[PDB]
Each structure stands twice: as structure tokens, then as C-alpha cells.
Design a protein around this ligand. Structure first.
Ligand code: FNO
Lengths: 295, 291
């Protein structure tokens, strides 16, 4: 099963931020609340907002921040790229050990979907190669965050900003820089063609071998270039020498050379799965990383 | 469409490690009682005997760093109830409930008292759970959360050879015809949860996917013969009633959606996908969709 991280450490950091008539989610760490800058926009500003102009007109008491039943007091504010940073009275007593990190396409993380400051659900994700997320967003999940948890330390890698016309989601890192070419404005912007994360499918095939399925193996090998020429006809991401290097341990553990697993995938794409399953799926799964598989 | 698990924070604060001799597994600490699988006292065992021979100093409970002192022990069916010196200050509001096949819940998978991940499950019609349990996940619990109140419905006991998992409710009653002993046991043949497929087709309609919709209607009887041929649970009037809110919401009557389903089964997706799948999901309940 694809699993998400236990969400407790993140749940204790979720707050509700309201400015005027707009409300979304915020993240309370130490004495700062982070949230999307869009909170300061009104209906009429969405098309062409001037965030510098809208923020200069605000004072500290324009921002209503609620942690459960407690109103937090804002004592300063500033903007860093597309995230608003609200200084409050009180350091979050439940602040975990944490860091901000920027991730790359193919990486996985968990998302705590929240509504008006209250967590609702948790799910496991990958950053797609077109810099989008195939999320499940309730209407007011703006400001919900994505994370990884390693040894009790939480890495915040994503903050939700908006839904694209195709149903997918776009957002920023916790420094307010968007993933992909998207902007916090209601324009016509659309996601690029999405491709399958090849290195993740191969890692998962190695996971199938480790758990004993070998049905899809064959006796062929391939060159890297030949593999990529085939795979790209199926909208699979090109495989690099870095990806090959990354799969080396798994190859070592299983005794199957990386380009041999590549030949198996070429054939799986040619034939389908003929009513069969691999780990437990009937689809080529691309949201488990090489790092994930070792775990 | 993503399946979502419930936020697990309220359960995370209840997870402890329990050790008896050489055996270590997970426990649930609520108030001054730790709940865990009785097979923690195993070396065809007689659990009546083995536990009379036990005393409090035989159990080592660890809540993270702190060792808890067992001051009493008792058995309820297949779960051991270890009374400890201190109440868990992180005890949520909670209830013990028993679910039925087809209902969904979240599992907090744990390793030696330490939460590792969370995922959303359904109780299969053969009473097993298609889960991913790591080494030492015994004693992990399943739950729903409703209004800040945790409903504990499942405790993990065993991996079946087929890879699926078997467990009890929190009162130690097994789900399915399984026993906590090393007999040879296998899951019975499983079936697809029809009322959940229908709910997921409703969700697909609510999401703008309408290609599978057709002009026809079927009967409950005609459908169940198709269902039976495809290893689908039979559909009942109760199921139909359950789906009424969705039928009302979408203007698609249940037996008209059934017709759509009959056709999907007989003829296939045919290059089309429904919600981003080419197989029909059966681990979303009608309730899950309404929410
Ligand atoms: C949060 C909530 C929202 O409703 C929106 C945004 C955030 O961050 C946002 O950034 C942008 C929009 C709006 O432009 C709709 C988006 C498109 C038309 C692409 C939000 O609505």
C-alpha cells in the first residue's frame, strides 16, 4: 500500500487565516504563520492583482488568525514571493523539529488537506513532471501543506495555492516560489503534458522482484538510448545516467541489471499486463521513489 | 480522485510498545489500560493457562522513553488488557465499534510502538484487509474519526499467506473465520464490493465523467446474475436505499447506474477511464463520497 506519513506533527501547526472576506489555511511554526498571499485578494483582484499595493494598505489587525478556539495576535507581516508571513504573539507550543525544502519532479510527499484550519484528510503524493499535483482538494484547501517526515523531523515542501482548469493543483515551496511556470493570478494557464516518472516505475518493478514476482522479466537488454526512444513514445520521462546510478543499489540487491529491467518495462508497455498484477496493482505505478522502495 | 486517510494525530498519541519475553508488538493506550493482541504471551496454545501463569512483571510497556508499570492484566477474547499505573494524558474521545464488510477505515501502521504511516482500507467481503504491514505491525489499529471523536474498529493480528491481513475489533472478536494460532488458514475467495463501485461511479458523474451513462435500466435480479458471474457482491434493497442521496443528487436512479455497471463488466472500459483509472474502485463508500 501506498502510505502517507503520520500527520500528527503537522496537525498541531494548522491554523485559519482570514483577511476581509477571504479565509484559508495557514501554517504556524514558532512565532510565524505562513499562508498564501492570495488571502489579501478580493473578488475583483484575482485577474490582475497587485500584491505590493494590496499589502501596503493592510495593518496587523486586518489579519484574523485562529488556532482552534484561540485568536492569535498578529504583530507584524511581510511577503516573501507568494507566501505571506504573519508574525504572532505566541510561538506555537506544538512546533515540531522542521525545515523547509524544495523538491523536484518525481519526488513524493504527504499532504494534509484542511478546511478553514481544520485537518480533514491525509494522502500521499508525487510532484508530477509538469510541476503539478494530482490532489484531492475540498473547496477551501488553499494553504494546505505537503511534507515528509524523517526521524521525527518534518520537511515542508509544498503549500497549496490553486486548482488548474484540468483539475490538478499548483503551489509553492514554503519560501513562496511556485513549482512550475504558474502564478497566483487567475489567468489562463494550463499544465503541460504529464508524463510518467520512469525512474519511479523501474524502482517499483525492482520492488516487485524483491517481493517475488518475476513474471514480467524477459531475456533482453537494451541500450539507454534505445530505451528512451521507445519509452518517450508512451509519454514516459527520459531516463538519465543519474537515474541509472540511483537504481544501482536495487539492481545490486536483486541481481538484475538496470538496463535489463528497462527491457522488461519496454515489453510491459508493448503488451500491457494481460490481466495480471504487479505488487497489487494493475497499472504501472509511478509514485514510489527509489528512496521509498528501500524503506 | 484520491482516497484519503483520516488525520492520525489523535491515535499517534496512544501507540505504545508491548513486550513479553522475546515477543514485541504494538499496543493501544487509552486511559489506564493498554490493549494489544493476546498472542504477545505466545512462545496450538491454551491462552487461559498461559495468562494465569503470567504476572505483572512479565509485561514491559514503553510509551516512547517512559516505561509504564503494569499493575493488572486480563483477557477479553483475543485482546489482552494491561492495566497500567498512569492514564494516557493524550487519550482522545473515543468509542469501540465493530464494522461490516465493505466499510472503510484508516490504519496507522506502527513499528515497535512507533507510528510509521497511515492508509485508508476497506474491510473486504472475506473479512480480510488488503494492507501493507511491515515487520512488527501487529497490534496496529484501524479507526474512523467523526467530529473529533475516534471510533476504533480494528486491531491487526496476522498476515495470511496470500499477503492480506486479519484482525479483531477492539473487544477481541475476530473479523472472519480465523484464529490466533499457527494453524494453516487462508482467506476465502474475495468479491468486489458492489455498493462501493456504484458510489464511485456516482462520484465520477459528480466529477463530470458521464460516458458510461446509458439510457437503460435493469432489475435487481437481472443485475445480481451478472454480478454473481463477475465475482461481485450481490446488491440489496438496503444498498439501493443507501445510495438514494446520490441518486437524488444526480438524477441517475440506482438501477440505471446498475445498467451502466452491467455494461462495464460485460464490455470493459475500452480505452476510456473513469476517474483516472481503468479498473473500478471498490474501497469508497457512499458515505465517503457524500463527504
Ligand atoms: C487560494 C485559494 C484560491 O481560491 C485561489 C488561490 C489561492 O491561493 C489562488 O492563488 C488563485 C485563485 C484564482 O486565481 C483561481 C485560479 C485560476 C483561475 C487558475 C484562487 O482562487
Amino acid at each position: 500500500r501506498k502510505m502517507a506519513f503520520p500527520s500528527g506533527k503537522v496537525e498541531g501547526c494548522m491554523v485559519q487565516v482570514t483577511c476581509g472576506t477571504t479565509t484559508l489555511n495557514g501554517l504556524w511554526l514558532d512565532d510565524v504563520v505562513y499562508c498564501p498571499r492570495h488571502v489579501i485578494c478580493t473578488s475583483e483582484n484575482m485577474l490582475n492583482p497587485n500584491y505590493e499595493d494590496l499589502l501596503i494598505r493592510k495593518s496587523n489587525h486586518n489579519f484574523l488568525v485562529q488556532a482552534g478556539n484561540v485568536q492569535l495576535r498578529v504583530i507584524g507581516h511581510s511577503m516573501q514571493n507568494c507566501v505571506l508571513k504573519l508574525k504572532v504573539d505566541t510561538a506555537n507550543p506544538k512546533t515540531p523539529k522542521y525545515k523547509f525544502v524544495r523538491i523536484q519532479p518525481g519526488q513524493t510527499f504527504s499532504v494534509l488537506a484542511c478546511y478553514n484550519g481544520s485537518p480533514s484528510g491525509v494522502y500521499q503524493c508525487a510532484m508530477r513532471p509538469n510541476f503539478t499535483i494530482k490532489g484531492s482538494f475540498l473547496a477551501g484547501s488553499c494553504g494546505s501543506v505537503g511534507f515528509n517526515i524523517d526521524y521525527d523531523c518534518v520537511s515542508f515542501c509544498y503549500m497549496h495555492h490553486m486548482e488548474l482548469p484540468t483539475g490538478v493543483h499548483a503551489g509553492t515551496d514554503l519560501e513562496g516560489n511556485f513549482y512550475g511556470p504558474f502564478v497566483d493570478r487567475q489567468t489562463a494557464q494550463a499544465a503541460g503534458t504529464d508524463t510518467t516518472i520512469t525512474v519511479n516505475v523501474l524502482a517499483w518493478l525492482y520492488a516487485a522482484v524483491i517481493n517475488g514476482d518475476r513474471w514480467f522479466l524477459n531475456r533482453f537488454t537494451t541500450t539507454l538510448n534505445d530505451f528512451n526512444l521507445v519509452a518517450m513514445k508512451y509519454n514516459y520521462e527520459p531516463l538519465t545516467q543519474d537515474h541509472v546510478d540511483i537504481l544501482g543499489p536495487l539492481s545490486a540487491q536483486t541481481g538484475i541489471a538496470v538496463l535489463d529491467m528497462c527491457a522488461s518495462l519496454k515489453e510491459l508497455l508493448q503488451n500491457g499486463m494481460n490481466g495480471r498484477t504487479i505488487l497489487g496493482s494493475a497499472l504501472l505505478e509511478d509514485e514510489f521513489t527509489p528512496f521509498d522502495v528501500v524503506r
